Specification:
Blueprint lengths: L1 E3 L5 H4 L5 E7 L4 E4 L2 H4 L10 H11 L27 H6 L3 H11 L1 H10 L14 H4 L6 H12 L7 H10 L1 E4 L4 E9 L6 E9 L4 E9 L8 H12 L5
Parallel strand pairs: 1-3
Antiparallel strand pairs: 2-3, 2-7, 4-5, 5-6, 6-7
Helix pairs in contact: 3-5, 3-9
The structure holds chloride ion.
The site of chloride ion has 2 residues, from loops.
Protein name: Beta-lactamase OXA-48
InterPro entries: Bact_Transpept/Beta-Lactamase, Beta-lactam/transpept-like, Beta-lactam_class-D_AS, PCN-bd_Tpept
Organism: Klebsiella pneumoniae
Length: about 240
């Protein structure tokens, strides 16, 4: 059911890094990773938490739809793309933390905790500040746990409406061409050691879906592009994409 291929470590060590890639073949119900241990180590989700946060905000009516505009609060931040109005689509595309921080305040501790428990999401622990726990609080999730959660979302099996799940999968759209569709979300965790980058999602093919979750050491922001680049290299090596 699970195969470990330690030779895949070269994808990371060739960049003087370390990490884990986890792949799941939905048709064959088989998993693959370079490192079974790190596949099951729990890290802060950071901006990958925008997936469950979006679902909860939609299902409770905090967010009406993917067109609702969340106005910039006029506070100049160091990420230029954050100093503008957003909707759900652009907020997920540019990982706009302050928009999702307001979602979390409106959701509130009680409803956030119950919903993460309903999702079986990570360690389901929101200890910390309700507007920052996915960045520096107690919540943790592993790469294998990300895949379990994503599989439920793909199949509309989470305990929110079908509509909420369809909208979030639309907002996850990252790449599409004649060969495949990728729906995914990046993450970048710097407030608690070890600093890591994430990329989680799946690849839609004509007759199969491959789920993936990866994290890697990220001592500086200079390496953030390696999250997608390495993952796609693995997908190409394994003949999942051309
Ligand atoms: Cl779509």
């Amino acid at each position: 059911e699970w195969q470990e291929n330690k030779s895949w470590n070269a994808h990371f060590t060739e960049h003087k890094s370390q990490g884990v890639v986890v792949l799941w073949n939905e048709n064959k119900q088989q998993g693959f990773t370079n490192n079974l241990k790190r596949a099951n180590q729990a890290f802060l989700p950071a901006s990958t938490f925008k997936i469950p946060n979006s679902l909860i905000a939609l299902d409770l009516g905090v967010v009406k739809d993917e067109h609702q505009v969340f106005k910039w609060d006029g506070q100049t931040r160091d990420i230029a793309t954050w100093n503008r109005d957003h909707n759900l689509i652009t907020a997920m595309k540019y990982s706009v933390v302050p928009v999702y921080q307001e979602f979390a305040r409106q959701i509130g501790e009680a409803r956030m905790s119950k919903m993460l428990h309903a999702f079986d999401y990570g360690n389901e622990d929101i200890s910390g500040n309700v507007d920052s726990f996915w960045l520096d609080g107690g919540i943790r999730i592993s790469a294998t746990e990300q895949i379990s959660f994503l599989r439920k979302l793909y199949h509309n099996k989470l305990h929110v409406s079908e509509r909420s799940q369809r909208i979030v999968k639309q907002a996850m759209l990252t790449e599409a061409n004649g060969d495949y569709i990728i729906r995914a979300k990046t993450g970048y965790s710097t407030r608690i050691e070890p600093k890591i980058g994430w990329w989680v999602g799946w690849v839609e093919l004509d007759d199969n879906v491959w789920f993936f979750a990866m994290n890697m050491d990220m001592p500086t922001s200079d390496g953030l592009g390696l999250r997608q680049a390495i993952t796609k290299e693995v997908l190409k090596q394994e003949k999942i994409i051309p």
